[PDB]
Amino acid sequence: DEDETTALVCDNGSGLVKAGFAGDDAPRAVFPSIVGRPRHQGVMVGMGQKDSYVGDEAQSKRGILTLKYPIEHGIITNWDDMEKIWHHTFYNELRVAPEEHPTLLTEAPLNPKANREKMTQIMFETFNVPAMYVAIQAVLSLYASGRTTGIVLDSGDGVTHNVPIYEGYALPHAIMRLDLAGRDLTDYLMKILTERGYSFVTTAEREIVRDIKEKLCYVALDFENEMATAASSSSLEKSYELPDGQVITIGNERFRCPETLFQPSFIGMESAGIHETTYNSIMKCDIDIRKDLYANNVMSGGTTMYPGIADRMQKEITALAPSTMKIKIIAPPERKYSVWIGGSILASLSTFQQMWITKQEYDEAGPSIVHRKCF
């Protein structure tokens, strides 16, 4: 752009599309990745602007809408709403043409084989797009922290991934992938809320469950001890008067939903927490590579934001690991935009030009350019 080549850097996901230009710090154009349709039909003369209320416009005027949620855990329910989702990004906020610039996205790691080629086709075959890459989340983060080796657990909304990384990259014997992440701890709140009285069952009230959660829940440090502390009215109970009008006293539900990360006994599955799936990934490596993965455990995404979390793992993760060390969680101050900032560097560094899919390469290769260049 202007004197230089430049580009756009993007982290999508299940929850938030976070768009920017390139060489930026952190995001500029950010919206939730959903389309919303009029559910509350009667008729119209005056109408609240839209056909498809999108992202930001959508999450704002919730109460006419069935929010059609797309990328639930990396898998998109049906693709059709997505092309409208990205029709926001470029031309509405950024005012660029995707037909001009390079586009960095993220691989939401272990998104299926065909979704690589389906996404590149939206861009190269439908919307032109001059070059693109889609960078595999958790490892970007590492470098922006100033780490080489470590075990990175990176989870925003959709999927939970423990990634052992070193001076060289990881491979699909060791690394793991669970459902039970940041949006599951959003949705999981309502399965519990029943025992006080409330279930925000339906679609606008669903988005309120996300919203209530993120602002004032916390993680239990040791749940079992804090369960008697549920008799202490002051630490727990606090008043969410909904600005529409209903008071959710979120009491125990504040930490009982966040515990589910470490405790899957609660939902009903044999997953161990992210503490134990961290051992699971670190053990199935070579024998020598380990020492330094223990020296720095990188913790990132919209999952690792909640109050009381790094501390937790600093107890937990000693119990059934190797013993001989300085074990140390490295969560950055803002640790959620891990993906984004680590990607920003790659998009700015003109040394990245060894790697990416350029316009013509797609037509030369066919749709299986993406697994001709990458994997």
Ligand X SMILES: Nc1ncnc2c1ncn2[C@@H]1O[C@H](COP(=O)(O)OP(=O)(O)O)[C@@H](O)[C@H]1O
| Contact window for Ca ion (CB under 5 A) among 4-12, 197-205, 247-255, 341-349 | 4-12
Report the residue number, 67 or 140, with the smaller CB distance to Ca ion. Answer: 140
Residue 337 CB, shortest distance to ligand X, in Å, is: 8
Please tell me whether residue 20 binds Ca ion under the rule CB under 5 A.
Answer: no
CA–CA distance, 295 with 328 (Å, rounded to integer) = 6
Please tell me whether residue 154 binds Ca ion under the rule CB under 5 A.
Answer: no
Please tell me whether residue 301 binds ligand X under the rule CB under 6 A.
Answer: yes
Enumerate residues 97-116 that contact ligand X by CB under 6 A.
106, 108
Residue 331 CB, shortest distance to ligand X, in Å, is: 12
Question: Of 16, 105, 123, 250, which lies in the binding site for ligand X, with binding defined by CB under 6 A?
Answer: 16
| Partner touching 319 among Ca ion, ligand X, a copy of itself, none, CB below 5 to 8 Å by kind | none
Question: Of 24, 107, 117, 214, which lies in the binding site for ligand X, with binding defined by CB under 6 A?
Answer: 214
Report the residue number, 268 or 333, with the smaller CB distance to a copy of itself. Answer: 268
Identify the CA nearest to 250 among candidates 202, 217, 220, 221.
217
CA of residue 253 relative to chain centroid, distance? 22
Please tell me whether residue 11 binds Ca ion under the rule CB under 5 A.
Answer: yes
Residue 239 CB, shortest distance to ligand X, in Å, is: 18
Q: Are the CB atoms for 11 and 339 separated by under 8 Å?
A: yes
| Partner touching 210 among Ca ion, ligand X, a copy of itself, none, CB below 5 to 8 Å by kind | ligand X
Please tell me whether residue 226 binds ligand X under the rule CB under 6 A.
Answer: no
Report the residue number, 71 or 285, with the smaller CB distance to Ca ion. Answer: 71
| Contact window for Ca ion (CB under 5 A) among 53-61, 149-157, 166-174, 249-257 | 149-157
Report the residue number, 152 or 193, with the smaller CB distance to Ca ion. Answer: 152
Residue 47 CB, shortest distance to ligand X, in Å, is: 26
Give the CA radius of gyration of the chain: 22
Q: Site size for ligand X, by CB under 6 A?
A: 25
Q: Binding mask 39-78 vs ligand X (x if CB under 6 A, - otherwise)?
A: ----------------------------------------
Please tell me whether residue 86 binds ligand X under the rule CB under 6 A.
Answer: no
Q: Are the CB atoms for 98 and 1 separated by under 8 Å?
A: no
Enumerate residues 340-369 that contact ligand X by CB under 6 A.
none
CA of residue 145 relative to chain centroid, distance? 18
CA–CA distance, 88 with 68 (Å, rounded to integer) = 16
Question: Of 103, 141, 186, 344, which lies in the binding site for ligand X, with binding defined by CB under 6 A?
Answer: 186
List, in sequence order, every residue forming a beta bridge with 135; answer none if it has no partner: 106
Identify the CA nearest to 341 among candidates 130, 88, 108, 139.
139
Which chain residues interact with ligand X by CB under 6 A?
Answer: 11-16, 106, 108, 137, 156-158, 182-183, 186, 210, 213-214, 301-303, 305-306, 336, 339
